[PDB]
Amino acid sequence: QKVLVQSGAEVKKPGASVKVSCRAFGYTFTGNPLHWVRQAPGQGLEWLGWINPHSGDTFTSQKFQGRVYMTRDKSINTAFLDVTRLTSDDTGIYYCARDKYYGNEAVGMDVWGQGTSVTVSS
Amino acid sequence: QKVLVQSGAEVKKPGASVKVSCRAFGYTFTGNPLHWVRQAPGQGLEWLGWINPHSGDTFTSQKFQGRVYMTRDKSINTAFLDVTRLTSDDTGIYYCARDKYYGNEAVGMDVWGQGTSVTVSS
Amino acid sequence: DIQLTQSPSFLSASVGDKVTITCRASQGVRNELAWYQQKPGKAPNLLIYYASTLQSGVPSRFSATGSGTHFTLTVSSLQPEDFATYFCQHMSSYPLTFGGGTKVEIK
Amino acid sequence: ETFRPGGGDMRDNWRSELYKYKVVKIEPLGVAPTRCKR
Amino acid sequence: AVGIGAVFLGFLGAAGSTMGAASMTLTVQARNLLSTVWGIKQLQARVLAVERYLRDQQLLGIWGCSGKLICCTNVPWNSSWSNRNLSEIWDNMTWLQWDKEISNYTQIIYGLLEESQNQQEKNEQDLLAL
Amino acid sequence: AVGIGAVFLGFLGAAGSTMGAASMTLTVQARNLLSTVWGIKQLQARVLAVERYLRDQQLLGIWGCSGKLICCTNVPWNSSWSNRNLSEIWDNMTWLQWDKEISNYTQIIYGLLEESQNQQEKNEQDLLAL
Amino acid sequence: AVGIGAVFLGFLGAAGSTMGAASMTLTVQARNLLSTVWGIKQLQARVLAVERYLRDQQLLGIWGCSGKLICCTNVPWNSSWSNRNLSEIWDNMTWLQWDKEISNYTQIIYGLLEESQNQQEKNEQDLLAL
Amino acid sequence: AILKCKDKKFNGTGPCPSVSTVQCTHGIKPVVSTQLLLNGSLAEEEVM
Ligand SMILES: *[C@@H]1O[C@H](CO)[C@@H](O[C@@H]2O[C@H](CO)[C@@H](O[C@@H]3O[C@H](CO)[C@@H](O)[C@H](O)[C@@H]3O)[C@H](O)[C@H]2NC(C)=O)[C@H](O)[C@H]1NC(C)=O
Ligand SMILES: *[C@@H]1O[C@H](CO)[C@@H](O[C@@H]2O[C@H](CO)[C@@H](O[C@@H]3O[C@H](CO)[C@@H](O)[C@H](O)[C@@H]3O)[C@H](O)[C@H]2NC(C)=O)[C@H](O)[C@H]1NC(C)=O
Ligand SMILES: *[C@@H]1O[C@H](CO)[C@@H](O[C@@H]2O[C@H](CO)[C@@H](O[C@@H]3O[C@H](CO)[C@@H](O)[C@H](O)[C@@H]3O)[C@H](O)[C@H]2NC(C)=O)[C@H](O)[C@H]1NC(C)=O
Ligand SMILES: *[C@@H]1O[C@H](CO)[C@@H](O[C@@H]2O[C@H](CO)[C@@H](O)[C@H](O)[C@H]2NC(C)=O)[C@H](O)[C@H]1NC(C)=O
Ligand SMILES: *[C@@H]1O[C@H](CO)[C@@H](O)[C@H](O)[C@H]1NC(C)=O
Structure with missing residues (x-):
């Protein structure tokens, strides 16, 4: 049931700002x-x-x-993840992942979003 | 609204006892x-x-x-004020006055009754 | 007791003039003073408490200053209904006592 | 200006008597800054 | 000046008084919080009064301030909630103005007190174990 | 003589016993205070019982005796209330006779305890400020 | 590893967690216990919730654990109630299994706590008399 | 609490020295009758 869903793919010019969303289902968000x-x-x-x-x-x-x-x-x-001053090196798939977080410390990323493709070009 | 009302005027012989009343209106009596x-x-x-x-x-x-x-x-x-052993020197207008009493200490009397005239003679 | 004297006992002044009345106390009171106005055969009314603060509803022409033993009540602009007996009273220690009485009369 | 008698709704009749009243709920809990420490 | 002692101003008589003076009548306000058309306008209102009083008591108890009318806590005063100094708070302002001012930060402060109380209980349990 | 420990006398079994013995069964009475014609003979009586219990608890709490069944206070026993010595009180008299005797001075003592609790809270707050 | 602090699991999110972890969210469960065919499906249910909460509060208070979420007591743990060691209790078992296991010895433990609290109050009264 | 007077020969008024506390009374049947009490309790000592 644990699922993460992001927004659609983004195409931006260099120097702009991109906002990648990530909503959770099937588990307590907090x-x-x-x-x-x-x-x-x-x-x-x-x-x-x-x-x-x-x-x-x-x-x-x-x-x-x-x-x-x-x-x-x-x-x-x-x-929400806000990335500013986009460049051609920032192209790729952004992923938002839930950590297992057993014992109030990082253990592992088990649930992953579908991945938002962000592209930067002139 | 703050008002004090007393009883009527009194005429007494020397050596008697007089009771002057004073009722409050418009503020907490205590x-x-x-x-x-x-x-x-x-x-x-x-x-x-x-x-x-x-x-x-x-x-x-x-x-x-x-x-x-x-x-x-x-x-x-x-x-109630009870004055016993009245004499000719006790004649006059008796007033009951509400103190401002800021800070749990005497400050000043701002509200006064109409004044009860007490007379003493043979 | 604490002796409380006033000066002048009687005064004459015209409407619009300034009147200054002096309270003196034998013992020292810091600000434990109150000024009152009493009309002929009527209940007295408070004018000043703490020797420098007007009672609510009092005209602004009234003013008073002083600490320790010497105090003054000033009527900046005399008015027709300002003619009455004036009293100055202490409450620092028992017994509370009132002034002898200052009467302002028209000229 | 012309004024005519009116009525019908009895809420106005009650309003003429309850005009000087309102209901409030007491909030006894409060938090303030003080130098004291537990 | 001279005086005889404290006076009683009534149920909410100290509402207009300063915080320092109003804090000396806390029990006065506290003690009156608990006490076929008219008959059924009482049963459902009494229950609501009981629920409100018990909500307040539980909220106090989960902070460690149970059975106390003035209670100090281990939660530091985040200055973002209010910037006023104490001199102008406890001597030149009433509680109604205070509740007007701080109406936005109530629940976060309550949660901070709750978690601090839980930490205190765990720490006390650990200490008594030794 | 020989003993084998304490015994249980019931809900109000210690009513006829002395104060010293009756004070050893306070919890027995304490825990029993909370628990279509017959159906509605329940909902209102339960509300009344809850209100009585909460009134008692609030009165205890505003004295500083919260969560306690025997509580010491800082209010001295003004002897005008009762002149009996302790020897004839705790060993030769029950609680019902005491309630008969001291019925007149209840509310003034309650107010004294309330104000003493308020003064204790203010003093504790002042002390912790240093 | 690296951490960023505690997290919030919800009203009963820690139900499946161990006792050590579940004891860090006691307030979360605690604060949620108080809050014409449909309208009367609310009044008596609210009354019942109030009575349940007050029964729990009185039961805690008559043990001396008033206003506390974790409370130590002077009643020794009779091993007949449970033989498990702490290592397998607080780190490899949840509270639901514990409630399943110890369902038989609840009332005797409650009575023991009650009498221990009464003894403690009497001892404190005796001590303050000197 | 319901206080029950166990004192036999008790005539319904005055001090009762034999007292008990009961959650509730014995089963009382609401028998409607005139001039004769029917299916009621009996005095355990003598006519009262
Ligand atoms: C209602 O408000 C008025 C004014 O806001 C309050 O009167 C004020 O009371 C305070 C103390 O109770 C007075 O402070 C005093 O000042 C004198 C002189 O500086 C000083 O010697 C004292 O030690 C004390 O600090 C203040 O002067 C006074 N202000 C006025 C205009 O009278 C009043 O107490 C309030 N009443 C209630 C019921 O809250
Ligand atoms: C009901 O009341 C009676 C008396 O009114 C209670 O019996 C009394 O119990 C006390 C102590 O429990 C006895 O005190 C004894 O005094 C003698 C004096 O010589 C002393 O030697 C003993 O060591 C003991 O301290 C008292 O004698 C006794 N009274 C009688 C007439 O035997 C009874 O306990 C009360 N019932 C309940 C349930 O409280
Ligand atoms: C639901 O149950 C599972 C186990 O059935 C819980 O996962 C377990 O969590 C504990 C503590 O968070 C883990 O213990 C850790 O073990 C590592 C390796 O030995 C050690 O280095 C740590 O210091 C800690 O002791 C345990 O390994 C882990 N088990 C598994 C199979 O992952 C889970 O936390 C439970 N969920 C909730 C919400 O309570
Ligand atoms: C009429 O009275 C007789 C005698 O008192 C009752 O018989 C008794 O019934 C009770 C049942 O509760 C028994 O415990 C007794 O042992 C019976 N006694 C005798 C002598 O038989 C009888 O039940 C009464 N009937 C009615 C209708 O009240
Ligand atoms: C019988 O009733 C009378 C009524 O006054 C009462 O005085 C008397 O004590 C009662 N009988 C007994 C044995 O108590």
Whole structure:
């Protein structure tokens, strides 16, 4: 029953801002943290960060601070990722994943969204 | 709305006892203390004492102790002053006054009764 | 007791003039003073409490200042219905006592 | 200006007597800042 | 000046008084919170009064302030809720204005108190285990 | 002589016993206070019982005796209420006779306890401020 | 590993968790216990909920655990009630299984707590007399 | 509480020294009759 659904694919010009949504089904939205990851075309997975939907606390990777922001709305059980200053290196599939989070610490990403394809070109 | 109403004028022989009433309107009777003052014909104001209606404690001037008594009835919001051993020097208008009593300490009497005229003669 | 004196006992002034009445106390009272106005054969009314604050509804022409033993009541602009007996009373310690009485009369 | 008698709705009749009254619910709980610490 | 003692202002007489003075009549307000057309306008209202009183008592109890009218807590005062200093709070303002001002941050403060109380209970249990 | 421990006398079995013995069965009375013609003879009486219990609990709580069955207070025993010495009170008299004797001074003592609790709360708040 | 703090699992989200984890969400369950054919399906149900909550509160209070969610007692754990060690209780079992296991010894434990609380109150009264 | 007077020979008024507490009384049958009480309780000592 645990499912994550995102918005549609995005095409943006360089320097714009993109908002990727992620809504949860089948589990308590505030009961687990949400990782935000990305995979470029033909490359590996790059860990952008993760957010706590309950307290609203966020952590961003040191090579992403000041550029990518995270928010949530519990009324509709959704988490938003805002990526600014888009470039051609930001192309790929963004994934929002629920962590198992046993023992109030990261254990593993078990439920994944369908993946939102974001493209950046002139 | 704050009003004090007393009984009618009294004429007494020397050595008798007089009871001056004072009922309150427009404010909480137990919420403020009541001074009892008198003004002789053509003279100044002489202060006899004051009563705390809530606790029932009283204070009388050191020149009137053992002669004048003070009581209150909360069920009817009334204050009674009993003066015994009347003399020709006790003639005048007796006033009952509500103290402002800010900070649980005397500040000033702002509401006064109409004044009960007590006369003493042979 | 605490002796409370007033000056002048009697005064003459015209409408529009200024009247200053002096309270003096034998012992020291910090601000434990009150000024009252009593008309002939009528209940007295409060004018000042704390020696510097007007009672609610009092005309703004009234003013008073003083601490310790010396106090003054000032009627900035005398008015026709301002002619009455004036009293100055302490409450620092028992017994409470009123002033001798100051009467303002028209000229 | 012309004024004519009216009525019909008896709520106005009650309103002329209850005009100086209202109902409130007491909220006894409150939170304030103080230097005290548990 | 001179005085004789405290006076009684009534059920809500201290509503217009400052917070410092109004905090000396807390029991006064507290004690009156519990007490065929007219007859059935009483049974359903008495129940509602009982539920309100018990909601308040439970809310106090889950903070550790049970059986107390003034209760200090371990939750620090986040200044974002209010920036006023104490001097202008407890001597120049009443409780109605305070409830007007802080009406937005009530539930988060309540949850913070709840979680702090739970942490306190767990810490006490751990301490008594040794 | 030889004993084998305490015994259970029932809901009001200790009514005829002395105060010292009756105070050892307070919980027995305490726990029994909460629990279409016959059907509606229940909903209103239950509300009345709940209200009586909550009134008693609130009166206890506003004295600082919350969650306690025997509670000491800071209000001195003004001897005008009763002149009997303890020796003839706790060992040669039951609680019913006491309730008969002291029925006149109940509310003033309750108010004294209320104000004493308020003063205790204010003093505790002042002390914890330092 | 890395953590970002606690999370909220809901009203009964910790039902399937162990006792150690479930004890960190006691307030979550605690605060939800109080809140013409349809209208009368509400009044008596609300009354019943109030009576259940008050029975639980009185039962806690007569043990000395008033206003507490985790409360230590002076009644030793008679091993006849349960032989399991703590290691397999607080880390490898939930509260539902515990309630299934210990359903037989509830009332005797409750009475033991009641009498222990009464003894504690009497002892405190005796101590404060000196 | 319902206080029951166990004192036999009790004539329905005054002090009862033999008292008990009962959750409720014995089963009372609402027998409607005039001039003769029917299917009621009997005095255990003598005519009362
Ligand atoms: C209703 O409001 C008025 C004014 O807002 C309150 O009167 C004020 O009471 C305070 C203390 O109760 C007075 O402060 C005092 O000031 C003097 C002189 O500075 C000082 O010596 C004292 O130690 C004290 O700090 C204040 O002056 C006074 N203001 C006025 C205009 O009278 C009144 O108490 C309020 N009444 C209720 C029932 O809340
Ligand atoms: C009902 O009342 C009677 C008396 O009114 C109670 O019996 C009394 O019980 C006390 C102590 O339980 C006895 O005190 C004894 O005093 C003698 C004095 O010589 C002393 O030697 C003993 O060690 C003991 O302290 C008292 O004698 C006794 N009264 C009689 C007439 O035997 C009875 O306990 C009460 N019932 C209930 C259920 O409380
Ligand atoms: C539902 O039940 C499962 C188990 O049936 C729970 O998962 C278990 O959670 C515990 C503690 O969160 C895990 O213990 C951990 O084990 C690792 C490895 O030994 C150790 O390093 C840790 O310190 C901790 O002791 C346990 O491994 C894990 N079991 C499985 C199979 O994943 C789960 O948490 C329960 N869900 C809820 C909501 O309570
Ligand atoms: C009429 O009275 C007789 C005698 O009192 C009743 O018989 C008794 O019935 C009870 C049943 O509750 C038995 O326990 C007794 O042992 C019976 N006693 C005798 C002597 O038989 C009889 O039940 C009464 N009948 C009615 C209708 O009240
Ligand atoms: C019988 O009733 C009378 C009525 O006054 C009462 O005085 C008397 O005590 C009763 N009998 C007994 C044995 O109590």
